[PDB]
Amino acid sequence: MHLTPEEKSAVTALWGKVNVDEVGGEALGRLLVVYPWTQRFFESFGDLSTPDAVMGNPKVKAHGKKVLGAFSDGLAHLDNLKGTFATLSELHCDKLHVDAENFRLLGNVLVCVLAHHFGKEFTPPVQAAYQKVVAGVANALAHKYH
Amino acid sequence: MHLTPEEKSAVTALWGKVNVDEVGGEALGRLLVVYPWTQRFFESFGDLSTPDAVMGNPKVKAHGKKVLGAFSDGLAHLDNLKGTFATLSELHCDKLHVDAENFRLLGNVLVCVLAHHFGKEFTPPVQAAYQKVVAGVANALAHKYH
Amino acid sequence: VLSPADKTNVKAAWGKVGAHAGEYGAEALERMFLSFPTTKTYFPHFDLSHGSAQVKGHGKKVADALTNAVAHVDDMPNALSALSDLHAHKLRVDPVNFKLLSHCLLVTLAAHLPAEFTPAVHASLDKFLASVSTVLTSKYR
Amino acid sequence: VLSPADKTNVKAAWGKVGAHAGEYGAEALERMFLSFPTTKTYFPHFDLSHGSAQVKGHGKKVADALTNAVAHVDDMPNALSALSDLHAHKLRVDPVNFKLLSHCLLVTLAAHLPAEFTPAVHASLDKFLASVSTVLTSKYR
Ligand code: HEM
Numbered sequence: 001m002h003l004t005p006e007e008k009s010a011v012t013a014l015w016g017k018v019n020v021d022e023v024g025g026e027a028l029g030r031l032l033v034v035y036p037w038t039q040r041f042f043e044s045f046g047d048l049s050t051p052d053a054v055m056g057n058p059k060v061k062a063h064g065k066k067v068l069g070a071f072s073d074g075l076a077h078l079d080n081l082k083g084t085f086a087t088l089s090e091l092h093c094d095k096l097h098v099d100a101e102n103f104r105l106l107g108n109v110l111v112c113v114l115a116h117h118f119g120k121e122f123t124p125p126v127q128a129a130y131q132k133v134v135a136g137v138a139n140a141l142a143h144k145y146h
Numbered sequence: 147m148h149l150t151p152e153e154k155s156a157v158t159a160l161w162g163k164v165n166v167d168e169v170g171g172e173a174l175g176r177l178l179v180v181y182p183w184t185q186r187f188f189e190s191f192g193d194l195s196t197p198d199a200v201m202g203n204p205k206v207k208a209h210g211k212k213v214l215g216a217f218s219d220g221l222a223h224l225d226n227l228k229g230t231f232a233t234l235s236e237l238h239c240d241k242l243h244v245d246a247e248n249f250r251l252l253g254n255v256l257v258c259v260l261a262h263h264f265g266k267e268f269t270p271p272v273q274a275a276y277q278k279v280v281a282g283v284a285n286a287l288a289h290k291y292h
Numbered sequence: 293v294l295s296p297a298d299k300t301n302v303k304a305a306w307g308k309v310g311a312h313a314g315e316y317g318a319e320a321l322e323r324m325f326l327s328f329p330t331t332k333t334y335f336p337h338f339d340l341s342h343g344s345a346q347v348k349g350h351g352k353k354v355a356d357a358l359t360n361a362v363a364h365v366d367d368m369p370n371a372l373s374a375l376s377d378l379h380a381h382k383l384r385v386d387p388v389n390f391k392l393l394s395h396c397l398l399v400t401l402a403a404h405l406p407a408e409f410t411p412a413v414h415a416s417l418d419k420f421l422a423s424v425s426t427v428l429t430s431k432y433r
Numbered sequence: 434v435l436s437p438a439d440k441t442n443v444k445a446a447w448g449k450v451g452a453h454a455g456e457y458g459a460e461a462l463e464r465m466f467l468s469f470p471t472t473k474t475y476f477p478h479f480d481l482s483h484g485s486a487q488v489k490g491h492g493k494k495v496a497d498a499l500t501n502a503v504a505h506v507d508d509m510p511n512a513l514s515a516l517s518d519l520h521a522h523k524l525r526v527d528p529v530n531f532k533l534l535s536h537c538l539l540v541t542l543a544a545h546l547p548a549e550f551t552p553a554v555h556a557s558l559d560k561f562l563a564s565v566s567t568v569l570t571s572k573y574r
C-alpha cells in the first residue's frame with residue numbers, strides 16, 4: 001500500500017474494534033440489497049427476495065464472515081496485498097467467474113457499514129485511509145484476472 | 147503496466163507509423179467534440195461552437211501536437227512513466243486544475259483515433275496493448291494529485 | 293426508477309436530517325475532498341481547509357437542493373432544471389464525480405442516522421442520489 | 434437525449450454497416466475480451482477462442498438488437514424492453530461492462546468506416562450506445 005504510517009495506524013486501530021462476524025454479515029447482505037445483481041452468484045443461498053430475507057439468511061451471514069475473515073488477514077500484509085491475494089485472485093477469476101467490479105462494490109459497502117457502526121469515530125481522515133485500503137484490496141483481488 | 151515483451155513490440159512497431167502532429171490534433175479535437183464538457187479548460191482557444199470550429203482551430207491543433215509529443219516521449223520510457231510524467235502530473239494538478247478523469251477520456255479517444263487511422267492493422271490484440279498503455283499514462287499523470 | 297417505497301424511504305430518512313442538512317452537506321464535501329482529491333480540481337477558488345466557510349456555505353447549498361429534490365421527487369427533472377443547466381453549461385463537472393459525492397453522502401448519512409440507515413433505506417437513498425445524478429448530467433451533450 | 438442530428442448520424446453510419454453488423458459485433462466482443470478480461474467472467478460457458486462460432490453467433494445477436502434499436506430510434510425503451518428484462522433479471526451483467534462494450538463497438542466501426550467515422554458521427558454513436566446501455570440497465574433495481 002501507499003499508506004502513511006499515520007494512515008496505517010488509523011486503519012489498524014479502528015479495525016481492532018471490529019466484530020468481523022457482524023460487520024461481514026452486514027456488508028455482504030447490504031451488498032445483495034443495494035446492488036441486486038450481485039445475487040447472481042448466490043442462488044444456492046435460498047430466499048433473497050427481500051431485504052429482510054437477505055439480512056436474515058445464514059448462508060449470507062456466514063459467507064460474509066468468510067470474506068471479511070480473509071480481508072482481515074490482508075490487513076496484516078498491507079505492504080503486499082498482491083502476494084496475499086494471488087491465490088484468491090486466481091480462484092475468483094478461474095473458478096468463481098466473479099467480475100472484479102464486484103470487489104469495488106463491496107469495498108464501498110464496507111465503508112458504509114463502518115460509518116454506520118462507528119458514527120463519530122469514522123472521520124473524513126479515517127474514511128480517506130479505508131478508501132485507499134478497499135481500493136488496494138480490490139486491486140490485489142483483480143490482479144490475476146486474465 | 148504489465149506490458150509483455152510482445153505487447154511492447156507491437157506498441158512501438160505501430161507507433162512507428164503515426165504522424166503525431168496529425169494524431170495529436172485529431173485526438174484532442176475529437177475529445178472536445180465527443181465530451182464537450184472538457185471544453186472547460188480551453189475557453190481561451192476561441193470558437194469551439196461546432197465540430198468544424200474545433201477540429202480546425204489552429205490552437206486545438208497546436209495543443210494536440212504538444213500533448214501527443216509529451217505522450218510519445220512517454221512511449222520511450224514505458225519502464226518509468228511515473229518518473230517520466232512527474233512534473234506534468236504536478237502541473238496538471240496544482241496549476242491547470244485538470245480532473246484526472248480527463249486523462250482516461252483522451253486515452254479512449256486516442257484509441258478510437260488509432261483504429262480510425264490503421265484500419266485492419268489495429269488488431270484486437272494491438273488494441274489491448276494500447277489499452278494498457280493509455281491507462282499506464284493516465285495513471286502516471288494522476289500519480290502526483292493530492 | 294424510484295418506487296413508491298423508495299420515495300417513502302427517502303422522504304423518511306431526509307425528514308430526520310432536518311436542521312442538520314447543512315452540516316451534513318459540508319461533511320460530505322469534506323469527506324470527498326479527502327478521499328478523492330481529484331475532486332478538488334473543481335474548487336481552486338475555495339479554501340478547502342477544515343471548517344472553511346466556503347466549504348460550509350457550499351454544503352448548505354447542495355443540501356438545500358437535495359431537500360428541494362426530495363420535495364419534488366415525483367418531478368425532479370423539473371425541480372432541478374436550472375441546476376442541470378448550470379452544471380451542463382457552466383460548471384461542466386465530469387460525470388464520474390457525481391458518484392463520488394453520492395457515496396460520501398451515504399457515508400455521512402450512515403454515520404449520523406444509525407437507526408434510520410437500514411438496508412432498504414440505504415438501497416433507496418443510493419437509487420435517489422443516482423437519479424439526482426442523472427438529472428444533473430442529462431443536458432451534458 | 435438523441436437530437437435529430439444524432440438520429441440522422443446513427444441511421445447513416447449503421448446504414449453503411451449493413452450486412453457486416455454480424456461480423457462487426459463478433460469483432461467488438463473479441464476486442465472486449467482481449468482488452469478487458471474481467472468481461473469474460475460472464476461467458477464461462479463459451480469457447481472464447483479466435484473464430485469461436487459461439488462468439489460468432491453471439492455477435493450476430495448483439496448486432497441484431499442494435500439494428501432493431503436503430504430501426505426504432507424513437508421508441509427504444511419499448512423496442513428493447515425484453516432485452517432490458519433479460520439483462521436485469523437473468524444475466525445481471527454489472528452496468529460498468531456496458532461502457533466497455535460500447536467502447537469496443539466504437540473502435541470496431543472506427544476501424545471499418547474511416548470515411549463515415551467523423552467527429553460528429555463519433556459523438557452521435559457514442560451518445561446512442563450510451564442510450565442503448567441506459568435502457569438495458571434501466572430495470573436493474
Ligand atoms: C473483499 C473482497 C473479497 C474477499 C477477500 C473474498 C474472499 C473470499 C474467500 C476467502 C472465499 C472462500 C472460498 C474458498 O476458499 O474456496 C470466497 C469465496 C467466494 N466469493 Fe469471494 N471474496 C471477496 C469478494 C467477493 C464478492 C464481492 C463476491 C460476489 C458478490 C464474491 C463471491 C464469492 C463466491 C461466490 C465464493 C464461493 C463461496 C462458495 O463456495 O459458496 N467474493 N471469497
Ligand code: HEM
Binds near residue numbers: 212214237
Ligand atoms: C496524455 C495526456 C496529456 C499529456 C501528455 C499532456 C501534456 C501537456 C503538456 C506537455 C502541456 C504544456 C505544459 C506547459 O504549459 O508548461 C499541457 C498543458 C495543458 N494540458 Fe495537458 N496533457 C495531457 C492531457 C490533457 C487533457 C485531457 C487535458 C484537458 C482535458 C489537458 C489540459 C491541459 C491544459 C488546459 C494545458 C495548458 C494550456 C494552455 O497553455 O492554456 N491535458 N499538457
Ligand code: HEM
Binds near residue numbers: 335
Ligand atoms: C448531488 C449532486 C450535486 C448537487 C445537488 C449539487 C448542487 C449544487 C448547487 C446547489 C450549487 C450552487 C448553485 C449556485 O451557486 O446558485 C452547485 C455549484 C457547484 N457545484 Fe454542484 N452539486 C452536485 C454535484 C457536484 C459535484 C460532484 C461537483 C464536483 C465535484 C460539483 C461542483 C460544483 C461547483 C464547482 C460549483 C460552484 C461552486 C462555487 O463556485 O460556489 N457539483 N452545485
Ligand code: HEM
Binds near residue numbers: 476519531565
Ligand atoms: C449494448 C450492449 C448489449 C446488447 C445490444 C446486448 C444484447 C444481447 C442479446 C440480443 C443477447 C441474446 C439474448 C437471446 O438469447 O435472445 C444477449 C445475451 C447476453 N449478453 Fe447482452 N447485450 C449487451 C451488453 C452486454 C454486456 C456488456 C455483457 C457482458 C460483458 C453482456 C452479456 C450477455 C450474456 C452473458 C448473454 C447470454 C449469452 C448466452 O448465454 O448465449 N451483454 N445480449
